[PDB]
Amino acid sequence: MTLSILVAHDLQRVIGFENQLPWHLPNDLKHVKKLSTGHTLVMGRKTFESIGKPLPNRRNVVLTSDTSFNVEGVDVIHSIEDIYQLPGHVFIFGGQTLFEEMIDKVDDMYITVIEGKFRGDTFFPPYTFEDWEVASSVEGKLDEKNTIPHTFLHLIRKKLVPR
Numbered sequence: 792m793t794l795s796i797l798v799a800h801d802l803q804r805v806i807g808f809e810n811q812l813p814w815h816l817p818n819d820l821k822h823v824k825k826l827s828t829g830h831t832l833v834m835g836r837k838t839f840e841s842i843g844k845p846l847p848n849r850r851n852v853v854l855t856s857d858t859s860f861n862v863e864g865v866d867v868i869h870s871i872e873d874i875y876q877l878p879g880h881v882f883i884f885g886g887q888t889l890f891e892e893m894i895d896k897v898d899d900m901y902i903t904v905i906e907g908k909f910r911g912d913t914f915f916p917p918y919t920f921e922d923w924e925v926a927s928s929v930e931g932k933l934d935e936k937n938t939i940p941h942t943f944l945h946l947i948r949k950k951l952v953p954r
């Protein structure tokens with residue numbers, strides 16, 4: 792319905808390594824909890840297995856081809872097309888495969904740019920700021936617990952108009 796991407800990627804758009812996040816950043820976890828609370832998270836199967844259980848107080852939706860999939864607290868879908876029937880604010884939550892499938896369909900993106908270069912094996916698709924308006928850009932606060940510089944972006948797809 793209202794369709795957003797929600798993602799953390801590094802300076803080279805790495806989002807993951809060995810089915811885990813490359814970095815430890817509690818503030819971003821806090822950012823995710825705040826944004827998606829009361830809403831819906833759609834994620835691919837590997838992302839779900841990585842987390843290992845549903846996130847509380849959210850509708851959790853998992854896209855998989857596995858007809859045997861029936862986890863407590865999770866709604867299953869089997870097609871991309873299923874996503875557009877989900878009501879409310881829906882966040883595309885990962886991973887790489889779902890980002891690639893959805894980045895041209897979403898209204899907007901909440902991206903946490905991790906200002907570092909990590910070793911990765913999964914990536915967020917390339918995108919241009921030519922196409923995305925910076926609705927907001929907020930530096931994350933560093934401290935003892937959060938030690939990689941990072942920036943919370945809210946990007947909104949630009950309309951194509953005649954010049």
Ligand SMILES: NC(=O)c1ccc[n+]([C@@H]2O[C@H](COP(=O)([O-])OP(=O)(O)OC[C@H]3O[C@@H](n4cnc5c(N)ncnc54)[C@H](OP(=O)(O)O)[C@@H]3O)[C@@H](O)[C@H]2O)c1
Nearest residue numbers: 798799806807810811835836837838855856885886887888
């Ligand atoms: N930094 C971030 O913000 C962020 C966000 C989330 C995850 N990540 C990460 O991203 C990584 C995983 O990415 P990934 O691409 O390999 O896996 P993934 O997107 O999480 O999910 C992979 C799977 O979802 C399925 N799927 C995708 N499209 C489908 C369709 N059209 N119809 C039916 N099923 C479909 C399949 O499940 P089946 O094989 O069971 O059919 C597929 O193999 C990890 O390393 C992880 O840590 C990071």
Ligand SMILES: CCCc1nc(N)nc(N)c1Cc1cc(/C=C/C(=O)N2N=Cc3ccccc3[C@@H]2C=C(C)C)c(OC)c(OC)c1
Nearest residue numbers: 797798799811812819820823824841842846847884885903
């Ligand atoms: C950690 C953030 C990763 C990420 N970042 C961004 N920007 N986009 C994103 N789309 C994600 C996705 C993402 C997520 C997570 C973590 C989820 C999680 O542990 N919570 N999610 C919300 C939630 C809701 C209710 C209760 C508890 C939680 C809990 C937060 C705590 C306070 C403990 C994750 O596991 C570490 C992970 O690994 C592949 C990926």
